[PDB]
Ligand binder design. Structure first.
Ligand SMILES: CC(=O)NC[C@@H]1[C@@H](O[C@@H]2O[C@H](CO)[C@H](O)[C@H](O)[C@H]2O)[C@H](O)[C@H]2[C@@H](O)CCN21
Length: 633
């Protein structure tokens, strides 16, 4: 017989270790590891030891490691033993480590993590968590120091028109932290509450309380959450109810997507929104978008902007000048609030009388138009937001192919359309992936989460390490899978109730029930009415992005769709996903039911809910309808 038995190494340091014991992988990679003698084992009695200042980081790391390892790991202050993980903040090491980098020393003093900042220590602890959560509790001795090549590393998350649940955003933020990603551009609506903007409080929106909460979580993770309110284009969700601010074409037809930048009350409305955001985001940036103002048309159809340009910026001024002038004016405005402005690059147009301010960060996604190398020559600060790093729920042209990018040698200087710039350009800030909803019924947010996994690891690797230590993408993939999600994602209770037969009094206006609940692979439920044999759907109402956003829309019974299939079944996506329901448990015990696509909450209508949509249609009082959570708590 083989005699196979667990090795069962003693906890702490051992001078003996096999020469080729695996060093568990991390993402980002920690390049330039220097091997030392022996190995260190996490085991019974191992503690995370730190100063008082780092106590919170130590306690959190101990708790997490206890969960992953099944060993009771406690935090402590005072002296560390070779059994222990030590956290050290040494701010004198800024040259070696920078604002975000860290050093690991693994040896007879235990596992030491050193950073020059709180975020640095935290980022070192992410590698420690990654290394210890792969079923191996012995780590080869040695040392490494690592810091990110680029300062901004992250994602555009367009939580726009449709709502991305705050629970999803919290998970997203935990995933970003695991991956040492420090940037999220969040295009979203913060619920407008002043008399002069409140008619734009249509769904999707986020409450001030909800934003304050995820910004606080982000900041603890070293993540800069930058808001975007796109302007002067893509303004439908803001101007629908304010036709007075919409731009009319030569024939007098207004577009709810277009802000009239010649109307000073329209510009003031935009600035009012900036002021509303300022109370809840902590970032020093403002992103105003400036993409696709004239999509589906041209400035020739808006002669009024030419007229405005000439008045404002002198004879010969063009609509491009007026557009750039609006950008420069928003720059002036947010600077005076201590912020730096950011735009999308298609906002950079050929001007005559006005020139675009060079203190504006350019996030470059669109390679038609002024080329990267040209902007380099100009001296602009640039972030790589290539379309190669896009996902869309509906536009299948936009699915990140991490394999292809890894194998083809993309790096952060590889701008849109494969146009290379010097990756060491001293004003290249970094790079990001971008997560766009577009026609939104094709994929649930949970399917989005599954799909983006590989691409998030790819961008993490190339923005921090800018190296390819895995021989191929497939080698990377095997290690990223072994590393897995951070604790918070593993803990999220996607489906808190068992499949089965339920009485659901909230649904009595639809059927007396009972209801058969079954779970879906994306972490939702289908709810079948045992009376009619049909399934509950949120199907009907006014939409944005082909998803029902109408506050007060009522659910309905429809023939049962097959909820067991994946997102490649595009032909049935709408019937399927309109039949998916998210069930959450209260603090504590009570359950809420939300349409998976809309992320509003079912409630019995009282007739006292207050919202712009409800001024013009209300569900019959006492019937069950969807509402944003803030109108029904
Ligand atoms: C920078 C970006 O690529 N802009 C152009 C478009 C994206 O447009 C956004 O669409 C969302 C809704 O999905 C918002 O309305 C936002 O204001 C727009 O900027 C679009 O998502 C994406 C891809 O479809 C391809 C082109 N970009």
């Amino acid at each position: 017989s083989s005699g196979l038995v667990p090795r069962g190494s003693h906890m702490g340091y051992s001078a003996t270790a096999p020469v080729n014991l695996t060093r568990p992988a991390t993402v980002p990679s920690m390049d330039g590891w220097t091997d030392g003698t022996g190995a260190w084992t996490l085991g019974e009695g191992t503690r995370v030891v730190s100063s008082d200042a780092l106590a919170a980081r130590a306690q959190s790391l101990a708790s997490e490691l206890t969960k992953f390892t099944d060993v009771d790991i406690k935090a402590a202050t005072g002296s560390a033993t070779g059994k222990d993980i030590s956290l050290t903040l040494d701010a004198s090491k800024k040259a070696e480590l920078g604002d975000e980098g860290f050093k690991l020393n693994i040896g007879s003093k235990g596992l030491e993590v050193i950073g020059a900042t709180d975020i640095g220590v935290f980022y070192g602890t992410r590698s420690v968590s990654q290394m210890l959560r792969q079923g191996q509790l012995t780590l080869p001795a040695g040392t490494v120091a690592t810091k990110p090549k680029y300062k901004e590393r992250g994602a555009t998350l367009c939580a726009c028109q449709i709502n991305i649940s705050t629970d999803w955003i919290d998970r997203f933020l935990s995933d970003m932290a695991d991956l040492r990603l420090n940037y999220v551009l969040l295009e979203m609506k913060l619920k407008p509450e002043e008399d002069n903007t409140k008619k734009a409080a249509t769904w999707s929106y986020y409450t001030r309380d909800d934003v304050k909460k995820f910004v606080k979580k982000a900041n603890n993770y070293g993540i800069d959450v930058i808001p975007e309110i796109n302007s002067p284009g893509h303004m439908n969700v803001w101007l629908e109810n304010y036709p007075e601010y919409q731009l009319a074409d030569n024939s007098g037809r207004k577009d709810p997507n277009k802000l009239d930048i010649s109307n000073p009350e329209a510009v003031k409305f935009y600035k009012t929104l900036i002021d509303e955001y300022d109370g809840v985001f902590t970032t020093k940036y403002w992103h105003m978008g400036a993409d696709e103002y004239m999509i589906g048309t041209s400035f020739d159809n808006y002669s009024k902007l030419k007229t405005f340009a000439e008045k404002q910026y002198g004879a010969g001024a063009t609509p491009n000048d007026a557009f750039t002038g609006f950008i420069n004016d928003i720059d002036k405005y947010v600077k005076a609030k201590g912020k730096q402005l950011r735009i999308w690059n298609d906002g950079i147009v050929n001007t005559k009388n006005v020139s675009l301010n060079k203190d504006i960060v350019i996030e470059y996604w669109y390679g038609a138009g002024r080329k990267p190398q040209e902007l380099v020559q100009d001296g602009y600060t640039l972030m790589n937001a290539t379309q190669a790093l896009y996902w869309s729920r509906s536009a299948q042209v936009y699915k990140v192919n991490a394999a292809r990018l890894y194998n083809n040698n993309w790096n952060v200087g590889t701008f849109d359309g494969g146009r290379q710039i010097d990756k060491n350009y001293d004003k290249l800030t970094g790079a990001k992936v971008s997560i766009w909803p577009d026609s939104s019924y094709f994929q649930t947010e949970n399917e989005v989460e599954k799909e983006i996994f590989d691409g998030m690891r790819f961008i993490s690797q190339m923005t921090w390490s800018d190296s390819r230590p895995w021989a191929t993408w497939n080698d990377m993939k095997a290690d990223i899978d072994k590393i897995g999600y951070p604790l918070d994602i593993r803990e999220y209770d996607y489906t808190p109730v068992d499949a089965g037969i339920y009485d659901i009094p909230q649904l009595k206006s639809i059927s007396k029930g009972p209801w058969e609940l079954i779970t879906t692979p994306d972490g939702y439920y289908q709810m079948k009415d045992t009376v009619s044999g049909k399934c509950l759907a949120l199907f009907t109402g006014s939409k944005h992005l082909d998803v029902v956003t109408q506050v007060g829309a009522r659910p309905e019974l429809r023939n049962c769709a097959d909820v067991s299939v994946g997102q490649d079944q595009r032909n049935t996506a709408n019937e399927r996903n309109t039949q998916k329901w998210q069930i959450r448990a209260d603090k504590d015990g009570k359950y809420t039911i939300s349409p998976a696509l809309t992320q509003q909450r079912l409630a019995i209508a009282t007739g006292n809910e207050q919202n712009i949509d409800l001024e013009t249609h209300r569900p019959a009082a006492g019937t069950v309808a969807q509402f944003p959570a803030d109108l029904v708590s």
